[PDB]
Design an enzyme around this catalytic site. Structure first.
Site, short mmCIF file in Angstrom:
data_model
loop_
_atom_site.label_atom_id
_atom_site.label_comp_id
_atom_site.label_asym_id
_atom_site.label_seq_id
_atom_site.Cartn_x
_atom_site.Cartn_y
_atom_site.Cartn_z
N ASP A 45 -43.59 42.68 26.90
CA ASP A 45 -44.46 43.25 28.37
C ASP A 45 -43.57 43.66 29.27
OD1 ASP A 45 -45.51 42.37 31.10
OD2 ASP A 45 -47.11 42.90 29.91
N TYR A 50 -39.96 48.18 36.55
CA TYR A 50 -38.70 47.61 36.28
C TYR A 50 -37.73 48.53 35.50
CZ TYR A 50 -42.21 43.81 36.65
OH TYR A 50 -43.14 43.09 37.23
N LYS A 71 -47.11 49.18 32.16
CA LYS A 71 -48.12 49.24 33.20
C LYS A 71 -47.82 50.50 34.04
CE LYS A 71 -47.64 44.20 33.80
NZ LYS A 71 -46.56 44.50 33.07
N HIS A 104 -51.04 48.38 37.43
CA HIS A 104 -50.32 47.29 37.79
C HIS A 104 -50.68 46.61 39.08
CE1 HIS A 104 -45.84 46.18 37.81
NE2 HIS A 104 -46.35 45.12 38.46
N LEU A 186 -45.16 29.71 35.58
CA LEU A 186 -44.32 28.25 35.68
C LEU A 186 -44.11 28.43 37.07
CD1 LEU A 186 -41.44 28.82 32.96
CD2 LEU A 186 -43.62 27.64 32.53
N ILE A 224 -47.32 35.03 29.22
CA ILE A 224 -46.00 35.84 29.24
C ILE A 224 -44.83 35.34 30.13
CG2 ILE A 224 -46.75 38.21 28.27
CD1 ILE A 224 -46.72 39.09 31.28
N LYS A 226 -41.18 34.76 31.26
CA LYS A 226 -39.86 35.49 31.47
C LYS A 226 -38.77 34.37 31.40
CE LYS A 226 -40.04 35.93 36.06
NZ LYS A 226 -39.58 36.48 37.50
N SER A 227 -37.60 35.06 30.60
CA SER A 227 -36.45 34.09 30.58
C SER A 227 -35.35 34.83 30.31
CB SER A 227 -36.54 33.03 29.53
OG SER A 227 -36.66 31.57 30.21
N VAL A 228 -34.09 34.73 30.80
CA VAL A 228 -32.87 35.27 30.17
C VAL A 228 -32.15 34.53 29.23
CG1 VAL A 228 -30.47 35.89 31.29
CG2 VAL A 228 -32.58 36.81 32.49
N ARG A 232 -33.97 29.25 26.68
CA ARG A 232 -35.25 28.98 27.36
C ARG A 232 -36.23 29.68 26.60
NH1 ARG A 232 -32.13 28.18 33.27
NH2 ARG A 232 -30.60 26.94 31.89
#
Length: 271
Positions: A45, A50, A71, A104, A186, A224, A226-228, A232
């Protein structure tokens, strides 16, 4: 232990857990996506906002199986302008036919979200996109685009986490067979150090994040995170080997606060 999927009213099916490539610079986006596909992510996604659709599209070069959402950003709302924006996104993402396309933000003050939706309707009808939905729509915005077209979004992607559980919007979603997708699952991390969450996490030999993701899952929600960190990423994905019980689910239900919203209010958001 299999991953789960969610099916839409339109007959299409989406993986229940995906990767929100929100805070990834355009440069290392391809590499983050290749990594997550390797770890087992089946849904990616992104959004025009971005500016990394070219990176996502490269990262999914030899992976047309991965479910792909993007989006339409606010300043491209309008009928002809959405049709162009969608085409442009399809080219940047190197996928002629996208799996899911979302508005969006409704941005009620623009006066354009109904015409935008009619563009999405036309993209579905013409077969240019598989599924169409929205992001950040209140029940009233949903009522409006349904009344104008007779065409229900398959998904409304909204801020949703233990502090802000969006129960009344989900009640409305239920009546119209609209799936709920949680962004901010989160709560920007607030939940990661909650004691109530911490006890449930001890009880299950899992982490706070995993308990919270499971909670979204068991509520039937598309999630969904997110994580770099690929540490994680693997963690967030490892959520199909335990079950939160009735006590667990009620205890989290009880975390819901009226001032739980962390991001913009759809009705007053201004960019």
């Amino acid at each position: 232990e299999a991953q789960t999927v969610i099916s839409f009213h339109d007959g299409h099916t989406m993986p229940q857990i995906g990767l929100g490539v929100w805070e990834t610079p355009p440069d290392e986006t391809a590499e983050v996506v290749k990594e997550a596909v390797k770890l087992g992510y089946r849904s990616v996604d992104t959004a025009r906002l971005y500016k990394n659709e070219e990176g996502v599209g490269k990262g999914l070069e030899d992976h047309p199986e991965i479910f792909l959402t993007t989006k339409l950003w606010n300043d491209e709302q309008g009928y002809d302008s959405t049709l162009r924006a969608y085409e442009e996104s399809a080219r940047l993402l190197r996928r002629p036919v996208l799996d899911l396309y979302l508005i969006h933000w409704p941005m009620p003050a623009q006066g354009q979200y109904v015409e935008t939706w009619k563009a999405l309707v036309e993209l579905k009808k013409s077969g240019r996109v598989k599924s169409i939905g929205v992001s950040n729509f209140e029940s009233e915005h949903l009522e409006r685009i349904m009344d104008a077209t007779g065409v229900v979004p398959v998904v409304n992607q909204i801020e949703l986490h233990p502090d802000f559980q969006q129960r009344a919007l989900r009640e409305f979603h239920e009546k119209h067979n609209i799936r709920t997708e949680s962004w901010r699952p989160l709560g920007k991390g607030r939940v990661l150090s909650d004691e109530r969450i911490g006890k449930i996490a001890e009880k299950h030999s899992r982490t706070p994040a995993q308990v919270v993701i499971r909670w979204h899952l068991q509520n039937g929600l598309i999630v969904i995170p997110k994580s770099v960190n690929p540490k994680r990423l693997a963690e967030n994905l490892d959520v199909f080997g335990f079950v939160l019980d009735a006590d667990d689910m009620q205890a989290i239900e009880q975390m819901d606060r009226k001032d739980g919203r962390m991001g913009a209010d759809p009705n007053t958001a201004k960019f």
